Enzyme design. Structure first.
Site, PDB file in Angstrom:
ATOM      1  N   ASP A   1     -96.561 -36.186-155.269  1.00 14.56           N
ATOM      2  CA  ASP A   1     -97.949 -35.749-155.181  1.00 14.56           C
ATOM      3  C   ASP A   1     -98.248 -34.506-156.010  1.00 14.56           C
ATOM      4  OD1 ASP A   1     -97.062 -33.454-153.855  1.00 14.56           O
ATOM      5  OD2 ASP A   1     -98.116 -33.931-151.976  1.00 14.56           O
TER       6      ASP A   1
ATOM      7  N   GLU B   1     -83.651 -29.208-142.615  1.00 19.40           N
ATOM      8  CA  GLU B   1     -84.904 -29.521-141.924  1.00 19.40           C
ATOM      9  C   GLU B   1     -84.631 -29.984-140.506  1.00 19.40           C
ATOM     10  OE1 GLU B   1     -87.944 -28.561-144.781  1.00 19.40           O
ATOM     11  OE2 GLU B   1     -87.983 -29.039-142.628  1.00 19.40           O
TER      12      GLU B   1
ATOM     13  N   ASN C   1     -95.064 -33.933-141.855  1.00 19.00           N
ATOM     14  CA  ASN C   1     -96.102 -33.236-141.092  1.00 19.00           C
ATOM     15  C   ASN C   1     -97.308 -34.122-140.806  1.00 19.00           C
ATOM     16  OD1 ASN C   1     -98.705 -31.267-141.291  1.00 19.00           O
ATOM     17  ND2 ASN C   1     -97.019 -30.360-140.179  1.00 19.00           N
TER      18      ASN C   1
ATOM     19  N   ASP D   1    -100.777 -24.474-136.547  1.00 22.38           N
ATOM     20  CA  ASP D   1    -102.081 -25.122-136.670  1.00 22.38           C
ATOM     21  C   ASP D   1    -102.246 -26.345-135.755  1.00 22.38           C
ATOM     22  OD1 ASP D   1    -100.585 -27.057-137.912  1.00 22.38           O
ATOM     23  OD2 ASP D   1    -101.727 -27.099-139.777  1.00 22.38           O
TER      24      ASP D   1
ATOM     25  N   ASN E   1     -96.221 -26.920-135.190  1.00 21.83           N
ATOM     26  CA  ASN E   1     -96.672 -25.814-136.033  1.00 21.83           C
ATOM     27  C   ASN E   1     -97.871 -25.095-135.417  1.00 21.83           C
ATOM     28  OD1 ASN E   1     -96.033 -28.255-138.395  1.00 21.83           O
ATOM     29  ND2 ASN E   1     -94.816 -26.412-138.228  1.00 21.83           N
TER      30      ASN E   1
ATOM     31  N   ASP F   1     -94.140 -31.618-137.069  1.00 22.50           N
ATOM     32  CA  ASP F   1     -93.242 -32.185-138.081  1.00 22.50           C
ATOM     33  C   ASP F   1     -92.287 -33.160-137.387  1.00 22.50           C
ATOM     34  OD1 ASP F   1     -94.245 -30.393-140.000  1.00 22.50           O
ATOM     35  OD2 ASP F   1     -92.829 -28.861-139.356  1.00 22.50           O
TER      36      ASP F   1
ATOM     37  N   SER G   1    -100.399 -29.100-135.837  1.00 24.35           N
ATOM     38  CA  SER G   1     -99.730 -30.280-136.372  1.00 24.35           C
ATOM     39  C   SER G   1     -98.268 -30.249-135.921  1.00 24.35           C
ATOM     40  CB  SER G   1     -99.824 -30.289-137.892  1.00 24.35           C
ATOM     41  OG  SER G   1     -99.084 -29.201-138.411  1.00 24.35           O
TER      42      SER G   1
END
Ligand code: NA
Length: 129
Positions: free
Chosen positions: A101, A35, A59, A48, A46, A52, A50
């Site tokens: 989650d 990562e 994110n 969209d 990203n 990271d 957002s």
């Protein structure tokens, strides 16, 4: 800070990640390698809008607030910049919420594509631990 492999493994173990939700320590070290290349200051934008953040590339659409991801959530209740600290406590605590989650470590694309189904304990071999 850019961690060494065994230094990061030791830090993650101290913070309770070894076998957390059933994921052995090598999974976490492998995920961090691909990562962020073990760099706490890593950031990536990203499509969209957002971004990271940090050693586990957490994110801003769901997990932290960076002031520029409109209509996002902040489920770890932290500014995203806290994820860039040389101290990995905030990243580890937020990662524990992510992995809990329902989707496990599949939340990390690099883990799914480069670590899942491999000999992940290779990432902690030779380490004292
Ligand atoms: Na957010």
């Amino acid at each position: 800070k850019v961690f060494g492999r065994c230094e990061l493994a030791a830090a993650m173990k101290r913070h309770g990640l070894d076998n957390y939700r059933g994921y052995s320590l090598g999974n976490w070290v492998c995920a961090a390698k691909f990562e962020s290349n073990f760099n706490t200051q890593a950031t990536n934008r990203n499509t969209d809008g957002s971004t990271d953040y940090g050693i586990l590339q957490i994110n801003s659409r769901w997990w932290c607030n960076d002031g520029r991801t409109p209509g996002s959530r902040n489920l770890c209740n932290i500014p995203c910049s806290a994820l860039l600290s040389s101290d990995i406590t905030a990243s580890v605590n937020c990662a524990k919420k992510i992995v809990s989650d329902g989707n496990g470590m599949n939340a990390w694309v690099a883990w799914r594509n480069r670590c899942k189904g491999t000999d992940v304990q290779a990432w902690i071999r030779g380490c004292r631990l």
